Amino acid sequence: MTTDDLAFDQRHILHPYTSMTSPLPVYPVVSAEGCELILSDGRRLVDGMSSWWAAIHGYNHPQLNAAMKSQIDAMSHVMFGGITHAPAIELCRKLVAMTPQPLECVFLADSGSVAVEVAMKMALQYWQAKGEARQRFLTFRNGYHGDTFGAMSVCDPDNSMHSLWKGYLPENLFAPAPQSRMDGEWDERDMVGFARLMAAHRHEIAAVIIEPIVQGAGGMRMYHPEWLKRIRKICDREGILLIADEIATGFGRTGKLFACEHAEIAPDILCLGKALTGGTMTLSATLTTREVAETISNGEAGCFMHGPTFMGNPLACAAANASLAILESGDWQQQVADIEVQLREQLAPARDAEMVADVRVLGAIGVVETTHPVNMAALQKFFVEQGVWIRPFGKLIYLMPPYIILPQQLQRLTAAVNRAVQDETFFCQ
Amino acid sequence: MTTDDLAFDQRHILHPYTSMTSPLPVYPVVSAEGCELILSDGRRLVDGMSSWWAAIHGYNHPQLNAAMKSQIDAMSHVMFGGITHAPAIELCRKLVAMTPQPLECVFLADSGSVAVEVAMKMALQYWQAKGEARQRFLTFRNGYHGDTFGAMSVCDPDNSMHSLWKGYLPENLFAPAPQSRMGEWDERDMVGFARLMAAHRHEIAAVIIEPIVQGAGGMRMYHPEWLKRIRKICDREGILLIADEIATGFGRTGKLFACEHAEIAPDILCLGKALTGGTMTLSATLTTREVAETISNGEAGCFMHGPTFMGNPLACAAANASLAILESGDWQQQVADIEVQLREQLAPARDAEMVADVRVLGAIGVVETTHPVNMAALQKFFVEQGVWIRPFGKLIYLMPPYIILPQQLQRLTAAVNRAVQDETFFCQ
Ligand SMILES: *Cc1c(COP(=O)(O)O)cnc(C)c1O
Ligand SMILES: *Cc1c(COP(=O)(O)O)cnc(C)c1O
Ligand SMILES: [K+]
Ligand SMILES: [K+]
């Protein structure tokens, strides 16, 4: 990589949610292995992010690599219209067996946002087949479900700047963000907002959609499992579908295989992404019940009206199957449990730092919320100089390391977070 | 694959736009090579579809394979927030260099539908930043732009069954489907489009169309004068033009981009499918400096979108390798020879009782039928003829890999002609 290559990237290549006229520095990565990212200049960094949740087995994993290359030798891709193949069947078998019993019908797709769109369309088509005028979604504030139009319509309106699209996006129902903590006690006052909305709009709600236990991109919030139990039963009593968006929480990150297990509930529709392929490449899956899948097919259309070009991509399914096979050992349970204790113990000191507002840990997720916004360019430089890849945002300095991280590597990450928050050097902007 | 594996697929796995309560047969593919798919029973099928447009270089291509394996060796994926990498920079260099001059800012995404959602959000954010109340899209009937909700809102309302979602989808503007054929130009074809532009020019964010070929919406092929006129109209009104070339891009119609047929540049270009050589999903939305800077100087301070796997190194490496095959220029004469053979060999379908129309453009050949096909029976007929042709509704069409041999292409056209001789494979 040359400096001319880096100038071209700055001038011509958009990156996720960041200015093109005032872009901040991007670091050139040439390769990755184990729990490390290797920069163009040779500097090695301990990855604290799993490339945003997904790389739960780290990088260049022997089993994922071997399965991907083996699938390339068979066929990287073939269409799924009128065709089926082993990678898709194996993957769907595994997804059906590892999720709650009622979830036995799988719609594979290309990204998390598309999986959410699929879920929302299944809820809308479901009710249309039943002859009921249900088109509204009840969700929580601080929620994040993706960047496409449908997904955006259930994302937090303030966080996502819905004023930009006011009049274009459909207006859904937003209950207050859950207050009771995963760490703490249950507070029944938490339910009043949700109850009031359900009471007023019960007859037009197609589905409730939430991120179970952890609200990721909307605030790295960790709430009490009683909420899901309460929501499930309200949905059961009212006849409303429950959509659980586990695109960030799925595949053991919160300490359980699926975060819905924390409440011992099953949704009607389940969305999965990120970590599904072990963070090797994009893929997603939307699982639903037979009741939903057949009801839609019996309606006017005669089928569920969705079908992406690369649906069922053999290469991504073979990578996902290898990733799930590693999880079948159950080793992730102990790894995640160990990461959780180390994050609790090592981020605990940060509660006394003057820049820190809160410290919360769940599974392989460790969050240090600050009182003021971080200075993105300065703090990112600091982390890179400490030999760590930690990508902060707003007032959140968080870690979600690969499950294979070593204790020495995890300690370098926590040491860096604590050092970052000791004074105001890297704060505001 | 066992018999039980196939039963599991039937009852538990959804497939594109097909019933779960009356599932129709699916064929188990174990591998693919050159221009052939290999079934589990060992039967080899000539692929007439390119796995829906994308596999323009066929399957198990040695160059595509080596490039993907090599990138797996470096890293298959790393996040793009705060990071960049060589596969992404090389792909963006190629995309900017090969598209019209003004198109120089690339937003990589994961699928065609997302690339269209991105294009639509660019247009909306662009006008929001300029302080103009513009939220309508003007499009053509019979268009297809994807399956996510924003993309669905500009898809043909009849074809895409908008009654299913009436009230959830924003209401856009639909001009008549272009009549003039790819054929003589009729000035009256423009009336409908002009009427809508006159009444809503103050409110239109962008015009969005599939240039020259309307794909999933009917495999329609229209006159390039339409694009010339639409570009001029957009310019005069200051409206953005979005060209969706997710199906037409990378040589399929005979030109590298179908916008070239009119020598026009859109303000926003969407690319997908064939971008990776049909190896895996990836998409890209290109726009101009004017659009991209204006958005970033607005209140959000950036373009508000960023998928988890944005810029995925593995898919970018596959697209770079696919584009490096096209750089040879061999596709130009390959597509030109395919077009001749399609014209010559689908000509006889004009003597068949079940045909309504025959139309060819570049490496696309379409036989429109009078009655809907019987999907299960016709699919099986094709499989038995040693070919993989996937029809839908009243269309039996071919879009083969550019490397297809004349003898393989002949087996496909012969099979199509045989299927349209009488009513056997029609209705259901
Ligand atoms: C990441 C994420 C999404 C969107 O996934 P993409 O692959 O970015 O489109 C959806 N929902 C949640 C909860 C996520 O974390
Ligand atoms: C294929 C197609 C799309 C949608 O792409 P997906 O990858 O299926 O989401 C959008 N536009 C056109 C013109 C296409 O042909
Ligand atoms: K299940
Ligand atoms: K260009």
Q: Which DSSP string corresponds to B300-367?
A: TSS-S---TTTT-HHHHHHHHHHHHHHHT-HHHHHHHHHHHHHHHHHGGGGG-TTEEEEEEETTEEEE
Tell me the H-state helices in B214-312. 225-237, 289-296
Query: Domain A61-330: which topology?
Result: Aspartate Aminotransferase; domain 2 (3.40.640)
Residue A19 contacts B, CB cutoff 8 Å: yes
| Three-state DSSP class for residue A28 | strand
Identify whether the C-beta of residue B380 lies closer than 8 Å to the C-beta of residue B394. no
Decide: helix, strand or coil at residue A302: coil
Beta partners for A207? A137, A241
Burial of A290 (0-12, 13-18, 19+ CB in 10 A): middle
Residue in this structure with the two tokens 């955006």, named with its chain if needed: A152
Cβ atoms of A249 and A258 closer than 8 Å: yes
- At what resolution in Å was this solved? 1.8
Contact B180, B186 (CB under 8 A): yes
A171: left (phi over 0), alpha (psi -120 to 50) or beta: beta
Query: Which residues have CB under 6 Å of ligand 2?
Result: A 308-310; B 111-113, 116, 144-147, 210, 215-216, 244, 246-247, 272-273
Question: In 10 A of CB A41, how many CB atoms?
Answer: 9
| Residue A152 CB-half CA count within 13 A | 24
Please check whether residue B245 touches A, CB under 8 A.
no
Helix (H) or strand (E) holding A113: helix A112-130
| B21 touching A (Cβ < 8 Å) | yes
With residues binned 3-state (H G I as helix, E B as strand, rest as coil), the percentages for chain A, rounded to 5, are: 40, 20, 40
Strand blocks (E) in A59-172: 83-84, 105-109, 136-140
Which of B356-392 are b and which e, b meaning 16 or more Cβ less than 10 Å from the residue's Cβ?
eebbbbbbbbbbbbeeebbbebbbbbbbebebbbbbb
Q: Residues near B236 by Cβ (< 8 Å), separated by ≥ 6? A: none
Q: State the Cα–Cα distance between residues A309 and B281, nearest whole angstrom.
A: 8
Q: Determine the residue of A111, A309, A310, A313 to mutate for testing ligand 2's pocket, defined as the one with the most ligand atoms within 8 A of the Cβ atom.
A: A309
Closest Cα to residue B308, out of B68, B71, B90, B81? Answer: B81
Going B291 to B293 to B299 to B300, the CA torsion angle's sign is positive
Residues of A assigned a catalytic role: 17, 144, 245, 274
Question: Which residue is associated with the tokens 């071919």?
Answer: B398
Q: Which chain B residues have a beta carbon less than 8 Å from that of A76? A: 59-60, 64-65, 68, 279-280, 318
DSSP, res A132: -
Q: DSSP states of B360-409 as a string?
A: EETTEEEEEESS-B-HHHHHHHHHHTTEE---BTTEEEE---TT--HHHH
Q: What is the DSSP letter of A177?
A: P
| DSSP, residue by residue, A271-300 | EE-GGGGTSSS--EEEEE-HHHHHHHHHST
The pairing of strands A205-210 and A388-389 is unpaired
Burial of B314 (0-12, 13-18, 19+ CB in 10 A): buried
Gap between the Cα atoms of B426 and B352, Å rounded: 13
Return d(Cα A274, Cα A287) in angstroms, integer: 15
Elucidation technique: X-ray
Cα–Cα distance measured from residue A122 to residue A114, given in angstroms and rounded to the nearest whole number:
12
Of A244, A243, A261, the C-alpha closest to A252 is A261
The C-alpha atoms of residue A134 and residue A126 are separated, in whole angstroms, by: 9
Q: Residue B35 in contact with residue B401, Cβ under 8 Å?
A: yes
- Cβ atoms within 10 Å, residue A337: 13
Residues in B 385-404 with any Cβ partner in A closer than 8 A: 390
**Rounded to an integer, what distance in angstroms lies between the CA atom of residue A32 and that of residue A37?**
4
Whether A211 is in the pocket of ligand 1, judged by its Cβ within 6 Å, is yes
Mutation target vs A (from B148, B161, B304, B389; most A CBs, 10 A cutoff): B148
Tell me if chain A has a CB within 8 Å of the CB of B380. no
DSSP secondary structure of A211-228: -SSEETTTT-EEB-THHH
DSSP A136: E
A235 Cα: distance to centroid of ligand 3 (angstroms):
19
CB atoms within 10 A of CB B427: 10
Q: Locate A284 and state its tokens.
A: 């997603």
| Phi, psi (deg, nearest 5) at residue A366 | -130, 120
Instruction: Name the β-bridge partners of A33.
Output: A36
Query: What whole-number distance in Å separates Cα of residue B393 and Cα of residue B395?
Result: 6
Helix (H) or strand (E) segment spanning residue A244: strand A241-245
**Cα–Cα dist A252/A275, whole Å:** 9
Residue spans per domain, chain A? 1-60+331-429, 61-330
Report which of B41, B61, B240, B221 is spatially closest to residue B137, judged by C-alpha positions: B240
Is the CB of A380 less than 8 angstroms away from the CB of B303?
Answer: no
* Ligand 2 pocket mutation, candidates B246, B250, B253, B270, criterion most atoms within 8 A of CB: B246
CATH homologous superfamily of B1-60+330-427: Aspartate Aminotransferase, domain 1 (3.90.1150.10)
Q: Collect all residues with Cβ–Cβ distance below 8 Å to B223 and sequence separation of at least 6.
A: B178, B180, B181, B182, B183, B185
Nearest of A268, A306, A296, A304 to residue A129 by alpha carbon: A296
- Cα separation, B292 vs B125, whole angstroms: 10
**A245 close to ligand 1 (CB < 6 Angstrom):** yes
Domain B61-329 in the same topology as domain B1-60+330-427: no
From CA A390, how far away is CA B377, in angstroms rounded? Answer: 56
| Locus of tokens 């769109």 | A117
Token pair for A266 = 């099953």
Instruction: Spell out the CATH class of B61-329.
Output: alpha beta
Cβ neighbours of residue A11 under 8 Å, at least 6 residues apart?
none
**CA gap B357, B28 in Å, rounded:** 32
Phi, psi of A343 (to 5 degrees): -65, -40
- Rounded Cα–Cα distance for residues A160 and A134 (Å): 25
B286: enclosing H helix or E strand: strand B283-287
A 10 A CB-CB count for B89 gives: 23
Which three-class secondary structure state does DSSP give residue A103? coil
Residues of B tagged active-site: 17, 144, 244, 273
How far does CA A171 lie from the centroid of its chain? 23
Q: Report whether A338 contacts A331 (CB < 8 A).
A: no
Length of chain B: 428
Whose CA is closest to A262, among A275, A272, A271, A253? A253
Nearest to B207 by CA among B262, B266, B285: B266
Architecture of domain A1-60+331-429: Alpha-Beta Complex (3.90)
Q: What three-state secondary structure class fits B62?
A: helix
Give the distance (Å) from ligand 2 centre to CA of residue B155. 11
Strand order through the sheet with B173-175: B105-109, B283-287, B268-271, B240-244, B204-209, B136-140, B173-175
A193: exposed, middle or buried (Cβ count in 10 Å: 0-12, 13-18, 19+):
middle
CA separation for the pair A257, A363 (Å, rounded): 11
- Taking CA atoms only, the protein residue closest to ligand 1 atom 11 is A145
Phi, psi (deg, nearest 5) at residue B415: -60, -45
From the list A174, A177, A173, A170, the residue with the least C-alpha distance to A142 is A177
Name residues 110-169 of chain A within 8 A of B (Cβ): 110-114, 117, 120-121, 124-125, 128, 135, 147-150, 153, 160-161, 164-165, 167-168
For chain B, the C-alpha Rg in angstroms (whole number) is: 22
3-state secondary structure of B222: strand
Dihedral angle over CA of A344, A345, A346, A348, nearest 10: 70
Pairwise CA distance, residues A267 & A242, whole Å: 5
Name the one residue in this structure whose structure tokens are 């991509």: A313
Residues A49/A60, Cβ–Cβ less than 8 Å: no
Given an 8 Å threshold on Cβ–Cβ distance, is A125 in contact with B164? Answer: yes
